[PDB]
Amino acid sequence: MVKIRLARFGSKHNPHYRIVVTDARRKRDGKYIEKIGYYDPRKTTPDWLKVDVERARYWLSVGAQPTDTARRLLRQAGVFRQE
Amino acid sequence: GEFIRTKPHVNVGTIGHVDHGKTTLTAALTFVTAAENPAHVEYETAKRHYSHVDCPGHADYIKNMITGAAQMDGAILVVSAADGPMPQTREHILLARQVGVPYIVVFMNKVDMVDDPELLDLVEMEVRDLLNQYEFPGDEVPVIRGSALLALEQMHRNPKTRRGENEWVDKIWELLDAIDEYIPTPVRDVDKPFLMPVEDVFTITGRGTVATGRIERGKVKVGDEVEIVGLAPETRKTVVTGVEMHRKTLQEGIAGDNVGVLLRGVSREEVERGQVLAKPGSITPHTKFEASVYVLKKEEGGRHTGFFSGYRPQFYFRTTDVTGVVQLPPGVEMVMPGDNVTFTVELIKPVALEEGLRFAIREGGRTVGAGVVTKILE
Amino acid sequence: RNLSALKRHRQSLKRRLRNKAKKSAIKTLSKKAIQLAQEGKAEEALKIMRKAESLIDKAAKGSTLHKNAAARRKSRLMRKVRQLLEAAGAPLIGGGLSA
Amino acid sequence: GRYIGPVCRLCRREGVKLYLKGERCYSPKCAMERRPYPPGQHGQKRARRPSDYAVRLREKQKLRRIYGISERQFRNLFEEASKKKGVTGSVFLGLLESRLDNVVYRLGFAVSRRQARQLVRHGHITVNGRRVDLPSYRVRPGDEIAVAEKSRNLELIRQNLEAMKGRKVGPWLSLDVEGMKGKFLRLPDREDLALPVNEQLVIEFYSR
RNA sequence: UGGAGAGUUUGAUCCUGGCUCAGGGUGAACGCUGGCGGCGUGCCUAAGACAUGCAAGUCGUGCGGGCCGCGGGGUUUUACUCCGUGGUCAGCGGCGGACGGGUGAGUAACGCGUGGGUGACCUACCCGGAAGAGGGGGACAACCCGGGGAAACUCGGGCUAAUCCCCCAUGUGGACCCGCCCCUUGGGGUGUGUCCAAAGGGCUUUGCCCGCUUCCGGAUGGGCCCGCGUCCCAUCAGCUAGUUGGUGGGGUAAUGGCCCACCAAGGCGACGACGGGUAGCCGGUCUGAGAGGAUGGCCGGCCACAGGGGCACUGAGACACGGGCCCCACUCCUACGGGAGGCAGCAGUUAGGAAUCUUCCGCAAUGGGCGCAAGCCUGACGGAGCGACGCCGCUUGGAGGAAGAAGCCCUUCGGGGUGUAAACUCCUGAACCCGGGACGAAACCCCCGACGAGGGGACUGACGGUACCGGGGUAAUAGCGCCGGCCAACUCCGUGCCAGCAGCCGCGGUAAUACGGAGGGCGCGAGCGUUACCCGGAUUCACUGGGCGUAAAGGGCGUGUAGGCGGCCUGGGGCGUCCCAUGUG
RNA sequence: AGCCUACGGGCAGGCGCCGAGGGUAGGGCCCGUGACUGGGGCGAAGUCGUAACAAGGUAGCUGUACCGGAAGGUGCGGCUGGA
RNA sequence: GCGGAUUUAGCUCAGGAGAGCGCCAGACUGAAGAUCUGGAGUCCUGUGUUCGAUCCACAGAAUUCGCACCA
Ligand SMILES: C/C=C\C=C\[C@@H]1O[C@](O)([C@H](CC)C(=O)NC/C=C/C=C(\C)[C@@H](OC)[C@@H](C)[C@@H]2O[C@H](/C=C/C=C/C=C(\C)C(=O)c3c(O)ccn(C)c3=O)[C@H](O)[C@@H]2O)[C@H](O)[C@H](O)C1(C)C
């Protein structure tokens, strides 16, 4: 089905993923259905994680199991916290 | 299939007149030993592991006998009891001497054809004298009497035939024992820089090119960088992708081992017989050098006329022969047979050379000189 | 050499042989029906035509007929029956079809 | 790179005396002061009117040789400069002056650009704390360019800043001779620079 | 924010006109040369042929066994070997094997591109909502028994478990025929009649978790259709029988000659039909001042194919590269009785060619399949290796040092040049040496709360003892092309229309700045040249932006069809045209 | 005629249409090659004559036609780029 | 690697080292040409056989064609 996962970018020895939603079937770095954030697993920038929630919120409201580690970041950006 | 080094390795082979039994004996040797331990073959005794080259021995294979004999630690001279020594017996003995085969073990074959004790003793006497004639210790060499054919046929009947069960097969064990005892295991120069003269080059279908030869010194293993020196326009450098002993994966080849070295990215058009594989920078290609040379006497099979400037004989270095132009010192018009002199040479093709390297000089199929490189000029 | 996926084939076969059957029944069973409408029968036709239906919707459960194929077979089957009994007979016998 | 080889051999040819050695290129012997003519068997012979091309050329080769920088590197700047909005003519220089090796020269730490390089390369220089050895490196406005602690005691870097006590320097700079650490005020404007060159020709030349 | 021109027809001139050079670019190759590193990149030729290893599986929380290794008594004991659990090999059954990876052969087509249509349609796993799961029955592997074979593997016989197949029930609902109302291509509702449902397994067990079934909605992924756009030859001009349409069928998820009967004769074409040739399309890429010209290699998207051709089955989805059937070619194996294979997956071999790599490390990260999870697989991927193929960074030193060694080259014999160059003196210190040493990795999992929201704990690194930091520390590679003009850089000797050079113009016939060597110089520099190809300059196919009296160019003249173009004034429409907004890109 | 049944029916097997390819036949389009033959291009100093440029020493040229070793000659007609 | 074929003036080519050609030079030219004058190997290498070797023998080399197998 449709998923919320990361897509590698940047250069070698310098990951820089892209929080995105695509159909499982498309390849990793394939064509996404819609972007929702970026993540730098090295924090070279003070802004390494980032996630448009409204969007990430929607894509879930419609069903879209995100990678385990896609959940992580999402969560971490306070996607589920409801108070 | 892997090859595990467990016994000292020795290189031997069969020489002797045509039809006397060299090839039949070679086959018998492999079958007989196969019963115990489960033209280039291998076989082992309780004492050593042997690589054996069976020389066709014909005149048109002369250059091949030269390189084959040069890599032998000892040779098995096969002489038919029904014929006695013949022209090739004498020819192979001289060649063995000139290329330095260190020891000779004799196998009087076809005794199944001769029973008369006197004729058998006469043949042995003749062979011993023949060996003495070329300066081999004829009176000390082992002379085993047997039948390669009957031994071979017995093994064909019963591949499991073991020592002590068949008189003919036991004669082969007598030879194997003589080889184990009379031919000493030489000291291998395993601590020196790797160097292996290329004997032949083949393409292992679906694997790449492979260069075979006997390691002269040093060692070699997969992942080792090696230079291909001589003959070609420039020295080529590659990496070893494989090392095999009789087509079996070998951990590391060492001096004395006759192996197959598979090379990376090199076609059979980039490696050839005569070139040498060596540790990068250990040896270089040259064409001009000075050398101390002994001109063989007519009484030693050489010519009665001497060397002269402009003479272009063949120079034999390790596994190949290249034409070289001789240049004598000023004033010297000729170097006569029996004399030792130093002159310059310019090969028509580059060859991996180094000071102290020995080489022979031949004009066609006749040995006319023995030299040693004394100085590399270029 | 071989890599155990043959089972799929194995299964394939079975599964085929499987529906091949039921599918034919639908047919033979269907024809049987129309044959009675063409022969201008009445109940027996419907009874058949009726049984027909059931056998079909049943085939729809498995990986045999599905989607509209389901209906398609019926939307036609009983579509003809009526248009064969309108040749006097009249659905005197309450079967699948309704006045 | 950085040329390497005869220099007061260009202190010639170009004619226009340019300082490549520094100290000596002040002596009564920049050789230009001794030989006012281009090197070679000829050099001193009636010279033909240089073609409208030779000019546009010789000027370029001049300026470039001044900073001792490869055509490749040179060229790349020029383009970049031709690209950046504004008066390409000027710009060029700016980027050409922003080279660390250069700065470290104007800031006195080095008796000549060639020497500058070495220093920058050997890590004897640093920036905003961390050290650098990228001669090419383009310094931004507001950067502190000083000697490294380990270097602070180099017999040379000493003798150099020594003379610096007194002399003023580039209006777009600020040398703190004491703690031997200059700053990068801003990109110099043409008026600020004053080399024996007509940037126009260079521009022209690159449209050949 | 952008546009430069020169050489060559003449005794000289202007014009025309072709040729040619200066620039940029390339998946390059070839020559001479070659020190360090990062990031990129690498069969353009035979869609020729391939050794070997590895590339797709996974569930014991669906079922029953074989083999192996633990724990425990029903009759009074071994036997019918009944039970809970942890290995292994298959079987059954489920989900995946239709993605991912590879290639450009074919395709001039609704293939691609772009913008719409679907009242003509499908969509497994994931979401949201509504509703339920009561009873029996059935047979096939495994397995056991006997048999054939070298192998691949197969026939006969006897048992058996299910989330396997089947029937009856229940039917919120949903499917189908006819009629009614609403709407309008078959869309929504409704009346009678008929038809269709389910599967258990696991834990903390009248309480949940994972599943099952049915229906509606969503989301994602498609099918089909249409308008416009997308190559050279007209020395290819007429083409067409399922051909064009029709009524009725068949077929499908669905439209439709897609297919079949029967009927009607149509349908297309100089706005280029039909035919030949050539070709995967786009995003983009290269050049140009732009308009254009050329191009489609890497990466992304669409299509197509898996030795050549055809066909179905299974399934949500395939006519399915590592599934099946048949024909053909080819290669192989063999016990000569039959069988086997399909690198355009990774790497590697051979052939061809001017030419294009390691049979590498790892699943640690990302992504994917199965599973509740632990976790298994992953040549996808993440890294490493090989080649100046490209881009970028960097080194072979720095400051001094003679009115100026030597050597070598010129020399009007005084001297001039190489040249501050060197030597020499000081300082720096690539390499090398020792010490320390990563980011990438926080989740899944464990405890509290509710297995959620929120908080706390723990494991995991291929690259790698590499980067990078600190200490010590030696002056430590340079080459190639050119120097008559265009085009920057000149003298001597040799040679004597010879030898040779050469992009166009041209040079060499005994004083050559053009050949060959030398001294010197100019250019670029770990590169420099050469050959090939694209754009430019070329306003030299000219819309921007050209022409035809003599330079190439008016049809021998006329009549006229299509087509192109069209006086003045008033009013209606508003297709071109123009503006705004919005979708898209 | 066989196999299964829960009697409806299914499978096996039989027949037919479609059908890859294979065969035979007769066409179309393109490429290669072929005794000999036709012209054409280019190549320092070979032969024959003199057509053209000055009335080019018969103005020239040109369509056509015949003719001659060769350029070319001539007939009719045309043009001036001849008088 | 195994075998065959091939290797004589500058160019073409055949047991007492030749033919043809043109080729080289001189004269002449301001030159080239044209004319006149004139001139002219190691036979792939070495060694051997022979009174004498391009020729015969052996060794070798190179070119070329076919064969070659496959750690
Ligand atoms: C021999 C061929 C190639 C050799 C190559 C190189 O040789 C070497 O360089 C080698 C090193 C010495 C070498 O150069 N050999 C090169 C040479 C080396 C020569 C030595 C040693 C010698 O001493 C003078 C000894 C044999 C010495 O001679 C005597 C021989 C007498 C023979 C008389 C034969 C005569 C009348 C005769 O008519 C005759 C015959 O009867 C039979 C066969 N035929 C054909 C004959 O004609 C005796 O036997 C002594 O022992 C090395 O071995 C290298 O590694 C190698 C093998 C690469």
Ligand SMILES: Nc1nc2c(ncn2[C@@H]2O[C@H](COP(=O)(O)OP(=O)(O)O)[C@@H](O)[C@H]2O)c(=O)[nH]1
């Ligand atoms: N009688 C007999 N014949 C033998 C013997 N050894 C070999 N042969 C034969 O002699 C011939 C030559 O043998 P081979 O080994 O080929 O000889 P090579 O030329 O030395 O290799 C063959 O026919 C063999 O069978 C033996 O011991 N006795």
Ligand SMILES: N[C@H](C=O)Cc1ccccc1
């Ligand atoms: N070990 C090598 C391969 O078998 C020895 C060899 C070389 C060459 C030929 C045969 C054997």
